[PDB]
Amino acid sequence: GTILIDLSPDDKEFQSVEEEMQSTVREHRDGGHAGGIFNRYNILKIQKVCNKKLWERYTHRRKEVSEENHNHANERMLFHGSPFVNAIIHKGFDERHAYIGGMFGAGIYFAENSSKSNQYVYGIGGGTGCPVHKDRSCYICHRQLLFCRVTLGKSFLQFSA
Amino acid sequence: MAHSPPGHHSVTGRPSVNGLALAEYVIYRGEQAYPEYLITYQIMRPE
Ligand SMILES: O=c1cc(-c2cccc(O)c2)oc2ccccc12
Numbered sequence: 001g002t003i004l005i006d007l008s009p010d011d012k013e014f015q016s017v018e019e020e021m022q023s024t025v026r027e028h029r030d031g032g033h034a035g036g037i038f039n040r041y042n043i044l045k046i047q048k049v050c051n052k053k054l055w056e057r058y059t060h061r062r063k064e065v066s067e068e069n070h071n072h073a074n075e076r077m078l079f080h081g082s083p084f085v086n087a088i089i090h091k092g093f094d095e096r097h098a099y100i101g102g103m104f105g106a107g108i109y110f111a112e113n114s115s116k117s118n119q120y121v122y123g124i125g126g127g128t129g130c131p132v133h134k135d136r137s138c139y140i141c142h143r144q145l146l147f148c149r150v151t152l153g154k155s156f157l158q159f160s161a
Numbered sequence: 162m163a164h165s166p167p168g169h170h171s172v173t174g175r176p177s178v179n180g181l182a183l184a185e186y187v188i189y190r191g192e193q194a195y196p197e198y199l200i201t202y203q204i205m206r207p208e
Pocket residue numbers: 079080081082083084096097098099100109110111116117118120124185186
């Protein structure tokens with residue numbers, strides 16, 4: 001069901017997604033161990049993900065949440081990074097993309113910091129790094145993140161370190 | 162997957178230590194997220 005549309009670097013949509021990716025880089029408490037050492041990215045490509053069935057599944061659930069929460073879906077745009085992104089774009093998020101050992105329980109995790117999701121691109125803790133050089137800080141190999149629309153509804157606020 | 166806390170639809174992980182960290186979020190239903198852009202990139206070696 002899925003098609004990928006390339007955005008031109010001249011397109012304002014390319015530019016605003018690139019800016020959210022670039023401007024939400026931060027330093028991480030692991031000194032780059034999981035995701036590598038960098039202050040910015042070389043964006044090679046931005047593709048829009050189009051799949052009707054997966055979109056309607058999202059908006060159906062969004063309306064339910066919204067009606068249980070005084071007509072407020074509480075929708076955000078958030079990053080997700082994983083070795084399964086090429087599967088998520090084709091079949092959508094499910095049980096297999098959960099973080100069973102995550103600190104808020106076994107669910108699917110999203111970040112406001114792009115560099116946070118970058119830590120999960122090659123696996124939990126960055127896995128063994130890139131497949132070709134086995135380098136978690138590889139500067140040669142191509143990486144991929146998702147920038148996602150996420151419905152939060154009434155969010156349980158967990159304070160945390 | 163686990164369930165949401167009763168009476169809620171997600172969990173917000175609100176950073177209470179790393180002052181520069183932004184929030185992280187957890188949903189317990191795959192249907193609460195749509196993967197809208199695929200970004201291909203390299204991290205860049207700092208100068
Ligand atoms: O993008 C994320 C992906 C993942 C992740 C974790 C385990 C398995 C997986 O397929 C993705 O975890 C995160 C945790 C906090 C913030 C963002 C992420």
